[PDB]
Ligand binder design. Structure first.
Ligand SMILES: *[C@@H]1O[C@H](CO[C@@H]2O[C@@H](C)[C@@H](O)[C@@H](O)[C@@H]2O)[C@@H](O)[C@H](O)[C@H]1NC(C)=O
Ligand SMILES: *[C@@H]1O[C@H](CO)[C@@H](O)[C@H](O)[C@H]1NC(C)=O
Ligand SMILES: *[C@@H]1O[C@H](CO)[C@@H](O)[C@H](O)[C@H]1NC(C)=O
Ligand SMILES: [Zn+2]
Ligand SMILES: [Zn+2]
Lengths: 265, 214, 208
């Protein structure tokens, strides 16, 4: 006999396009179970469930792929016929298409001090937020103007979008880094302009240039007398004088004067 | 080397006031000076760069000035979360040197503590020790005196205290107090009390317990 | 985002050495010079030295010459400072910093002591209308110790008190205040951690 209890159907309330779902349908208290036919289907698509049997029951588990042709509210159904009687369970499932938000930069690599604008568009009904702006999502697209600076090189611009589907919030996000080229710099902290060393002492002159791309460095006095940056040298009277340090890269050129003063013993 | 002397050491001030940190250099160093903020248990944080040039992501209330030997950091409107140590640093000639430091404290209205006494746990009594803890939370000003009393008599020795840092949000203090006796001494007295004399009340606030009555 | 990740707490014998690493990320490692700063527990900063991140050339303050040795692994974008002949005076927090001290590491607490490591004994503490619970972490060495509640769930309303030294062993406590209606109806566990001894105790606060 087939009981008056309908089958239990377990399935997610929503399912994304081009993704695989999992549906399981079960019923206890029916016999003979071998004579029972289980028909599992999502809308028009007849599913193929691998059925586990007991002496008095069945458990039908089935995967279900969905495409753009399934988009919308489909009906997941699980019918069980046992001779003359029949029990079926219905459940709605919404197949939704929700692409990832498109964070779009005017130019991927920009020069320093340039007006860069970062946009993020998404699904019309969805609501987006660009690096937490606006706080609490409102409308499907957001902007952000910025004066490009060296600190913005490698700066990520994340966009979070939320889409309401069948009474629940689905979340997605996208992230894109900005590349910012910035001219050479000889900053004082990594290249001081004044040394004072005792004669015949071991010293290492220090000077690093900043820039994207990495600048090439060269410090010369009296024409072509190189200051050995990074090397540990014996300080002599020959090293005394004012050097002209020059940083070089595709973004420009900078100079800094570095004086070396030798104290006689 | 270039010596940087900061003043004052401690800088107690109410929220909303205009505070100023001083940093004097031994030589004349142009504008090669930088200011750092250090909150407790935290790394130093660059606030102002080269005397007066502002850093991105730093509040507008932080500004700097000066040139040569004297330099100044100024907070337009001081807030409770500005409690920290502040250091100047010169970059004119190596080695880099820092100032002695200035500590920014925040003034506040008076608030009475929430006193709580605790017996030794069953775990500690097994080991042969007996520590009685007494927390006093969320009070101002910092000055507070806890007095331990075992069956009426005061206990001089075996007491260790520890104040928390001033709170970033409400600027209150908190204290724990631990009286540590031996198992044989604790199992030989009924009542235990930590009374706390504070500015907020004339008579002391008293929490107590008996080991017999759980 | 720029990150300087240092090696973390060290306990070393007097005369021994220690090698603090500073694993960097989120920027071009060879663009900026890496500086190293020391902070004593009296809270006074001191520049140890700097190292060139292209050619490995280093410069030291006169005090830390022979004491400190800066090195670099460019492939892994990591800076190493080795300290040797360690005395008690070398006990402090050491920081790597870069880009003219714009980005710092979290700090590395180095402790120089002949005293051996001792794991903490964690004891629970239990008694308008709002309960206050406690947690006594007694008799451990060296610092530091990480105390949290319910795996850091109960963050707000927590007071962890500075540890204090008494006879070669530290003693620390923590406090938490939650609604009296939500205890002991709901669970409250003190999650203490002492990395040096590899200890991780979880003491539930039983009503007494
Ligand atoms: C289904 O099976 C139930 C349990 O059967 C008993 O235990 C199993 C493990 C076997 O040992 C079997 O030989 C035993 O009979 C029964 O209680 C139940 O009646 C069965 N259902 C129906 C409709 O017959
Ligand atoms: C179906 O089967 C039931 C149960 O055995 C039986 O009573 C009935 O006669 C059948 N009805 C039809 C329409 O076949
Ligand atoms: C984006 O969302 C995912 C959700 O899994 C989260 O793990 C991640 O941290 C988010 N990334 C960014 C850049 O916001
Ligand atoms: Zn000097
Ligand atoms: Zn006695």
């Amino acid at each position: 006999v087939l009981p008056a209890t309908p089958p239990q159907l377990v399935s997610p309330r929503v399912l994304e396009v081009d993704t695989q779902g999992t549906v399981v349908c079960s019923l206890d208290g029916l016999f003979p179970v071998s004579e029972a036919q289980v028909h599992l289907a999502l809308g028009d698509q007849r599913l193929n469930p691998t059925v586990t049997y007991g002496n008095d029951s069945f458990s039908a588990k089935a995967s279900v792929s969905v495409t753009a042709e399934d988009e919308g509210t489909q009906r997941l159904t699980c019918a069980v016929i046992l001779g003359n009687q029949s029990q079926e369970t219905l459940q709605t499932v919404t197949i939704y298409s929700f692409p990832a938000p498109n964070v779009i930069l005017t130019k991927p690599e920009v020069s320093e001090g340039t007006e860069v604008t970062v946009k993020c568009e998404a699904h019309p009904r969805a609501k987006v937020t660009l690096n937490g702006v606006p706080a609490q999502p409102l409308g499907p697209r957001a902007q952000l103007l910025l004066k490009a600076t060296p600190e913005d090189n490698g700066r990520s611009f994340s966009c979070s979008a939320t889409l309401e589907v069948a009474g629940q919030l689905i979340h997605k996000n996208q992230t894109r880094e900005l590349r910012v080229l910035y001219g050479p710099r000889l900053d004082e902290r990594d290249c001081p302009g004044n040394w004072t060393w005792p004669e015949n002492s071991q010293q290492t002159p220090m000077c690093q240039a900043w820039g994207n791309p990495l600048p090439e460095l060269k410090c010369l006095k009296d024409g072509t007398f190189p200051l050995p940056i990074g090397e540990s040298v014996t300080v002599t009277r020959d090293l005394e004088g004012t050097y002209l340090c020059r940083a070089r890269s595709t973004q420009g050129e900078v100079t800094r004067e570095v004086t070396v003063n030798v104290l006689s013993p | 080397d270039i010596l940087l002397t900061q003043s004052p050491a401690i800088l107690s001030v109410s929220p909303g006031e205009r505070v100023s940190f001083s940093c004097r250099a031994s030589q004349s160093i142009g504008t090669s000076i930088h200011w750092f903020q250090q909150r407790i248990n935290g790394s130093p944080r660059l606030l102002i760069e080269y005397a007066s040039e502002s850093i991105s992501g730093i509040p507008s209330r932080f500004s700097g000035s000066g040139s040569g030997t004297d330099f100044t950091l100024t907070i337009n409107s001081v807030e409770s979360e500005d409690i920290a140590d502040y250091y100047c640093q010169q970059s004119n000639v190596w080695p880099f040197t820092f100032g002695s430091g200035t500590k920014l404290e925040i003034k506040r209205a008076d608030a009475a503590p929430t006193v709580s006494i605790f017996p030794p746990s069953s775990e500690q009594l097994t080991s042969g020790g007996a520590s009685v803890v007494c927390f006093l939370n969320n009070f101002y000003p910092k000055d507070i005196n806890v007095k331990w009393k075992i069956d009426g008599s005061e206990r001089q020795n075996g007491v260790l205290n520890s104040w928390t840092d001033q709170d970033s949000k409400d600027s209150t203090y908190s204290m724990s107090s631990t009286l540590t006796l031996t198992k044989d001494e604790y199992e030989r007295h009924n009542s235990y009390t930590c009374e706390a004399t504070h500015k907020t009340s004339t008579s002391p606030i008293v929490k107590s317990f008996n080991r017999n009555e759980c | 985002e720029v990150q300087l990740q240092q090696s973390g707490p060290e306990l070393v014998q007097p005369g021994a050495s220690v090698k603090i690493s500073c694993k960097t990320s989120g920027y071009t490692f060879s663009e900026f010079t890496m500086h190293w700063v020391k902070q004593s527990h009296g809270k006074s900063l001191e520049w140890i030295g700097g190292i060139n991140t292209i050619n490995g050339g280093s410069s030291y303050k006169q005090s830390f010459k022979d004491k400190a040795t800066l090195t670099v692994d460019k492939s892994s974008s990591t800076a190493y400072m080795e300290l040797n002949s360690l005395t008690s005076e070398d006990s402090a927090v050491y920081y790597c910093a870069t880009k003219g001290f714009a980005y710092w590491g979290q700090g590395t607490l180095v402790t120089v002591s002949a005293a051996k490591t001792t794991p903490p004994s964690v004891y629970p503490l239990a008694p308008n209308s709002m309960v206050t619970l406690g947690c006594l972490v007694k008799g451990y060495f060296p610092e530091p110790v990480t105390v949290t509640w319910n795996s850091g769930s109960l963050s707000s309303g927590v007071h962890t008190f500075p540890a204090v030294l008494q006879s070669d062993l530290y003693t620390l406590s923590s406090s938490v205040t939650v609604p009296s209606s939500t205890w002991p109806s709901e669970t409250v566990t003190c999650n203490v951690a002492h990395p040096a001894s590899s200890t991780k105790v979880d003491k539930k606060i039983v009503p007494r």
